[PDB]
Every structure is written in structure tokens, then in C-alpha cells.
């Protein structure tokens, strides 16, 4: 796992990528690690923000599946042609596998200026793969074709350059301190988990806990922010405003639309509260908490103008598709995606962004006598209901 330590790079707010090779002879590309989707897709035609891309004509091992795929996002899209080719991870396991690859032939708002990834590695499950769940995701081919154990772990360390580690097939004990706590993968589609309680500086938000998981909660390395369902987000902002009320920020700040600044090195970190999300434990009635510092959810943005000011963006935002535990949360922790045991572990990261008097933490157990089920059951559409899964 020493070969895999430090195999991630990225830019702040543009995710983390790992090198991969596609084709023979191998074409090296920088690929976004995305635990919130399930396609392996690579830029495969010229684009003004890419200077390399997968050229299927140069790969003697490439085979066309003769099927297109179209992937809309709320903010953009990619589309392309499905095929298979040999794939390896130069700073990962010593193996090569034959994987599905979507060659992206057109896209809109997907490849960003001065972003240096040329593709996306969807690490989530077949159920959310496009065009449907019969396109086997990369990690499933990896595991089926080799002896790599069915698990990977991410150490995401906090435009400024960022680094981290994806350990494929293992847990590297040098990347965390202290205890490793597991929460169940509630269902294998996204990496879905259940939050049972939320506290802001030790004060319970006191919502029905189903609200925390409406309509799901997921661990997502392809999302920058901590995103929270609307009602949860409003209660959180109310509570963070109350703690920081010595400072009156504009509304655009709370929307993530405006930076706020203090004189160099003077930021009053101590007026911003910690946030603790309690995740359901492997034992009924148990939970454990992960505790986020302001230094994780206030993200520094280097000011081209005001020179000796430290300026920050608020990186908690609204969601209408459940809680999203993005970079803001993952950057505190070493996150173990234990697919074999259908669970996600959290430990304090060996690279966490500390504070004078407080630390990102993973702590448990907390027991409740309270039964309550905090999971939300998504209303089943007639479209979902009809599809056969043979
Ligand atoms: C995986 C990936 C590329 C999928 C994606 C597709 C498109 Cl078309 C536009 C943006 C994104 C995207 N957005 C992330 C930020 C990002 C961009 C590039 C690489 C990694 C992460 C995101 N995070 C938020 O917190 C967020 C919050 N609100 C709205 C949209 C948001 N979008 N992530
Ligand atoms: Zn480059
Ligand atoms: Zn059938
Ligand atoms: Zn199916």
C-alpha cells in the first residue's frame, strides 16, 4: 500500500483524480475519483479545456460495444460511445483488467477550465450505472477479474493544489489515527448511509431523524460541499449564525455566493461551531459521530484583490436529493469503502486540517434506547416498479 499512498491530486473545489492507463499501448489520463456515480468515462475527442484524451484509434485492444450513452446532470452533461479496453492504475494494484469505458464524444459544462482531469471513475454500484445496471462498473470488473479484495479507502487531504490516497483493496494504517468506526451501507446503489442525529456545537438540531436522510444520505467524493436537505440546511444555518453572531455576514455568504474576509492570520475560528453527524452503528441502538471543524466547511479562496486578507467561502449548501457528504466532510477522515462487508468506516485522517483548540474527531459509541428507524423510503415510481432485473 506504500505504492498507493499519495496517488491522488486535484484543485480545490474540482475533486481528486488518480492516474489510469487505458488501451495498448497504454494512454495515461488523470481520472476523477467519484463515489457518487458508477460509470467509467473518459474524454475521447478534442475539447478546449483538455490537452489529452482517449484515442480509441490508437488502442489495439479497444472493442466498440456499438451502443451510445447519454448522461444528463442538473448542471450539464456528457455523452458518448460504450466500449471495453484494458485498464490499469499505475500507482494502484499490479493488475490490468478489461473494463467498460464510455468514450465521451460531446459534453457541456463537464470539463472545467484549468481542471486537469480528463475522465471520471464512478466507484458506486451497478444500480445507478448509465444506460442501465447491466453495464458493469469498473470496480466490479476489477474484483471479478483479479484477486484484489473488494474494498477501497480514500484519504482526501485539504486554485490551491490538493493531494490524498486511494488505497485499492486494503486499509493502510499509516493514513489514520485512533479508532475506525463502521456505519452500514443501507443499500448498494449510491454509498448510502443513515444519519441518526445532528449537533451544532454540542446542541441537538432536534429534527425527526428521517429529515436527515430525506431522501437519502450518501458519501460522495464527487461533491465539494456538505449538502443538506432544505429543512436541515435552514436549521443548520440558523444555528451557525447564532454561534457567529459577533459577525454579521451578507446573505450571499450563507448561500455560498460571496466570500467573507479578515486580516491575514486573524480569522476568529473560535466563533464558528463544530458540526457532528452521528451515523448509525453496526449494532442496533449504537451510533458514532464524526465531528467537522469550521476549517473544513469554510473554504479558503485566494483573493486576487484584497492582498493581506484571508477570505472564505461557506461550503455547506442546500440539496434536494438528500444529504451529500462531499469533500467538506471526507477531508477530515480516512474513509473505508468496505464493499465486502457492506459498510463504510471513518477514522481521523493522518492529514486533517486542525485548529488551535479543537480537532476533527470520530467518536463512539452513543447508545439510544429509542428504536426509531431514521431511513427514508423513496416513493416507488411505476417506472422503477416495472423494470425486470434478471
Ligand atoms: C462528479 C462531478 C464532476 C459531476 C458534475 C457534473 C457536472 Cl455536468 C457539473 C458538476 C459536477 C460535479 N460537481 C461538484 C463539484 C466538482 C466539480 C468537479 C470535480 C469534482 C467536484 C459539485 N459539488 C457541490 O458541492 C455542488 C453544490 N451545489 C451544486 C452543484 C455542486 N456540484 N461533480
Ligand atoms: Zn496538463
Ligand atoms: Zn423479465
Ligand atoms: Zn437490473
Curated annotation (Swiss-Prot):
Topological domains annotated Extracellular: 1-384
EC number, UniProt record: 3.4.23.46
Family stated for the protein in its record: Belongs to the peptidase A1 family.
Record keywords: Acetylation, Aspartyl protease, Cell membrane, Cell projection, Cytoplasmic vesicle, Disulfide bond, Endoplasmic reticulum, Endosome, Glycoprotein, Golgi apparatus, Hydrolase, Isopeptide bond, Lipoprotein, Lysosome, Membrane, Palmitate, Phosphoprotein, Protease, Signal, Transmembrane, Transmembrane helix, Ubl conjugation, Zymogen
Principal place of residence: membrane
Record text on activity regulation: Inhibited by RTN3 and RTN4.
Carbohydrate attachment residues: 94, 113, 285
Domain remark text: DXXLL motif is required for a proper endocytosis and retrograde transport to the trans-Golgi network, as well as for regulation of lysosomal degradation.
Tissue distribution of the protein: Expressed at high levels in the brain and pancreas. In the brain, expression is highest in the substantia nigra, locus coruleus and medulla oblongata.
Protein name as catalogued: Beta-secretase 1
Known function: Responsible for the proteolytic processing of the amyloid precursor protein (APP). Cleaves at the N-terminus of the A-beta peptide sequence, between residues 671 and 672 of APP, leads to the generation and extracellular release of beta-cleaved soluble APP, and a corresponding cell-associated C-terminal fragment which is later released by gamma-secretase. Cleaves CHL1.
Catalytic activity, as annotated: Broad endopeptidase specificity. Cleaves Glu-Val-Asn-Leu-|-Asp-Ala-Glu-Phe in the Swedish variant of Alzheimer's amyloid precursor protein
Effect upon mutating residue 34 to N: Decreases beta-cleaved soluble APP production
Summary of subunit composition and partner proteins: Monomer. Interacts with RTN1; RTN2; RTN3 and RTN4; the interaction leads to inhibition of amyloid precursor protein processing. Interacts with SNX6. Interacts with PCSK9. Interacts with NAT8 and NAT8B. Interacts with BIN1. Interacts (via extracellular domain) with ADAM10 (via extracellular domain). Interacts with SORL1; this interaction may affect binding with APP and hence reduce APP cleavage. Interacts with NRDC AND NRG1.
Substitution effect: residue 215 to N: Almost abolishes beta-cleaved soluble APP production
Disulfide bond annotation, renumbered to this chain: 157-351, 209-374, 261-311
GO molecular function, a single term: peptidase activity
Domain annotation Peptidase A1: ranges: 16-347
Active-site residues, record numbering mapped to chain: 34, 220
GO cellular component, one term: endosome
